[PDB]
Design a protein around this ligand. Structure first.
Ligand SMILES: [Zn+2]
Length: 485
C-alpha cells in the first residue's frame, strides 16, 4: 500500500504494469507526455488517476515508487526525471514478472482459430461465474504474461509466433501456462523459416504446460501428446463436404500419412504403418452438420448450435470445450457458452444482401480452404483477394490456385495480382495493383480494395456472392460499401 507513478504508463506494457500494481492495492497514478489514451475508461474504472500531457514533478517527487515502461528503459528525458527522486524505488517490467501467477492460466496456440477459440472459452468461463482478465488493448510477448498477472480466477491468453524460436516457450513459461491448447498446425509465418522449424516452435508449448488440449485430427499436433493430454476431434459428419486435402508426413517415421477420412484440409482420421495412429478423442463432435452438432464428453451429450458454422468453427468449439472440461466446468455451461457465443467481426461477416457481400479475415491456405468449404453461394462466386501472405509468393500462389474454384478472382493487392497469373479461373484486375513503385511487400490499400470491390459489384448479379478475403478487406470493406451505399 504505497504511492506509485508509472511513467509511460499509457503504452501497451506500461498500462498493464500500472493496472497490475494497482491491483495489489496502491496509490497508483499514470504519468505520460502523451495527452491521449483509449485506456482512460479502464484506468478510471480501476482507480488509476492520470497525469497526461506532461509529468507532474510534485507527483514524482512525493511518490515512493516509480515504474518505467520497457519501451523507455534508457530515455535521457525520463531518467533526468527519475533521478530527481533518487531514494524512490524502481520498478521495471522484470520486477513485475517476478510476481507469482497462481491463477490457472490457459494458453492458446496454433496456426488458425486462436482468437475464436479464446473468445468461446472466455464466454464459457464468464457465464460460469469466473473472472477473466482483459488486457483492453488495441494491438506482443509481454502482453500474455502480464495479462495473466491481472486480477481474476482464470487467465486465457494467446501465445503465437511469427516463427521465432523460444518465443512461444519464453512467453508461456512467463505466463505460467497450466493448460496448453493447440488448435491446428499449417503453413503460415514461414517467411524465411522452414515449415519444420515452425512446427518446432509450436511444440514449445508442450515444454511448459502441465496439461495439454490437443487436436486429434491434426497429426502433427496429436504427436505432441503426453500423459496429461485431453484430445478433441470429429468422429463423423452428416453433411458432405469438399476435402481441400493437404498431405502430412508421419512425425515418427517420416512416411507419408494415410487417411481413412478427411474433414478439412489435413484434419481427418489418419494412420501410419509404423504404428502411429490418431488418438480417439474424449471431447468429440458427433453428427456434424453446418450449424449444429452433438458435443460428447464422457457420459454427456449436448447439441451445439453455432451462429457462424463450418467444420473449422466446430474445431474451434471443440478446443474451447476441451479446455473448459480440463477446467471442470459443468457440461451444460460448456454448451451454453458455445450456443450463446457472439462471433468476432470479420469472421464471415455479411455486409450487403443483394448481391451477397461477405468479408473475412482469411489470410492463409488453411483459412481460405475453411471458408470456401463452408460458404455456399446460391449464385456465382466472385472473390476479391486483398491477401498478401506473410510467408511470401509461394503461399500466395497456393492460395490463388485454391481460389480457382471462384467464378471470378479480383486481386486487391500487389502480391495477389502477381500470384493470380498461376490460377485457372477468370481473373479481372484493377489498375491500383498494376505497378508497385516501392520495393518489398506492400499490403492492400484502401484504394486497391475500393477498386476491386467496385469491379466486383460491376460483374455481380443480385443473386451472386462477392467474398472479400484478407486483412485489408475486413479493415476497409464496410466503409467502402457504406460510402458507396
Ligand atoms: Zn509413421
Amino acid at each position: 500500500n504505497k504511492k506509485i507513478v508509472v511513467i509511460g504508463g499509457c503504452g501497451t506494457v506500461g498500462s498493464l504494469m500500472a493496472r497490475i500494481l494497482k491491483s495489489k492495492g496502491n496509490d497508483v497514478t499514470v504519468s505520460d507526455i502523451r495527452k491521449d489514451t483509449y485506456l482512460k475508461d479502464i484506468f478510471k474504472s480501476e482507480g488509476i488517476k492520470l497525469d497526461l500531457g506532461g509529468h507532474d514533478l510534485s507527483l514524482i517527487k512525493k511518490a515512493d515508487a516509480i515504474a518505467i515502461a520497457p519501451s523507455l528503459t534508457n530515455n535521457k528525458k525520463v531518467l533526468n526525471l527519475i533521478n530527481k527522486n533518487p531514494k524512490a524505488e524502481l520498478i521495471k517490467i522484470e520486477d513485475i514478472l517476478k510476481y507469482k501467477v497462481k491463477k490457472p492460466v490457459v494458453g492458446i496456440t496454433g496456426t488458425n482459430g486462436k482468437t475464436t477459440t479464446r473468445e468461446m472459452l472466455k464466454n464459457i468461463l464468464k457465464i460460469s461465474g469466473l473472472e477473466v482478465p482483459e488486457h483492453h488493448l488495441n494491438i506482443t510477448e509481454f502482453i500474455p504474461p502480464l495479462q495473466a498477472r491481472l486480477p481474476g480466477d482464470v487467465a486465457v491468453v494467446e501465445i503465437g509466433t511469427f516463427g521465432v524460436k523460444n518465443e512461444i516457450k519464453r512467453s508461456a513459461k512467463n505466463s505460467n501456462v497450466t493448460v496448453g491448447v493447440i488448435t491446428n498446425i499449417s503453413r503460415d509465418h514461414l517467411k524465411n523459416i522452414s515449415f519444420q522449424e515452425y512446427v518446432e516452435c509450436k511444440k514449445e508449448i508442450t515444454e511448459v504446460a502441465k496439461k495439454l488440449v490437443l487436436n486429434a485430427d491434426d497429426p502433427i499436433v496429436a504427436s505432441f501428446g503426453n500423459d496429461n493430454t485431453v484430445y478433441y476431434g470429429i468422429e463423423n459428419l452428416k453433411i458432405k463436404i469438399k476435402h481441400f486435402f493437404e498431405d502430412r508426413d508421419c512425425p515418427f517415421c517420416g512416411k507419408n500419412l494415410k487417411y481413412e477420412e478427411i474433414f478439412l484440409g489435413h484434419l481427418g482420421k489418419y494412420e501410419c504403418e509404423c504404428g502411429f495412429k490418431r488418438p480417439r478423442p474424449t471431447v468429440k463432435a458427433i453428427d456434424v452438420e453446418n450449424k449444429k452438432f452433438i458435443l460428447s464428453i464422457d457420459s454427456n451429450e449436448g447439441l451445439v448450435k453455432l451462429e457462424y458454422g463450418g467444420i473449422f468453427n466446430v474445431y474451434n468449439a471443440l478446443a474451447a470445450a476441451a479446455a473448459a472440461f480440463i477446467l471442470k466446468i459443468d457440461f451444460d455451461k460448456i454448451i451454453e457458452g458455445l450456443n450463446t457465443f457472439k462471433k468476432v467481426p470479420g469472421r464471415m461477416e455479411k455486409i450487403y444482401k443483394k448481391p451477397e457481400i461477405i468479408i473475412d479475415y482469411a489470410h492463409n491456405v488453411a483459412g481460405v480452404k475453411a471458408i470456401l468449404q463452408t460458404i455456399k453461394p446460391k449464385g456465382r462466386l466472385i472473390v476479391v483477394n486483398t491477401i498478401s501472405s506473410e510467408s511470401g509468393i509461394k503461399e500466395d500462389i497456393k492460395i490463388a490456385k485454391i481460389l480457382s474454384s471462384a467464378d471470378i478472382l479480383i486481386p486487391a493487392s500487389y502480391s495477389a495480382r502477381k500470384a493470380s497469373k498461376y490460377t485457372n479461373t477468370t481473373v479481372i484486375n484493377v489498375k491500383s495493383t498494376e505497378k508497385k513503385f516501392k520495393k518489398g511487400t506492400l499490403g492492400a490499400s484502401k484504394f486497391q480494395v475500393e477498386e476491386a470491390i467496385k469491379k466486383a459489384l460491376s460483374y455481380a448479379d443480385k443473386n451472386d456472392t462477392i467474398l472479400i478475403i484478407g486483412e485489408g478487406g475486413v479493415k476497409y470493406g464496410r466503409e467502402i460499401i457504406e460510402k458507396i451505399k
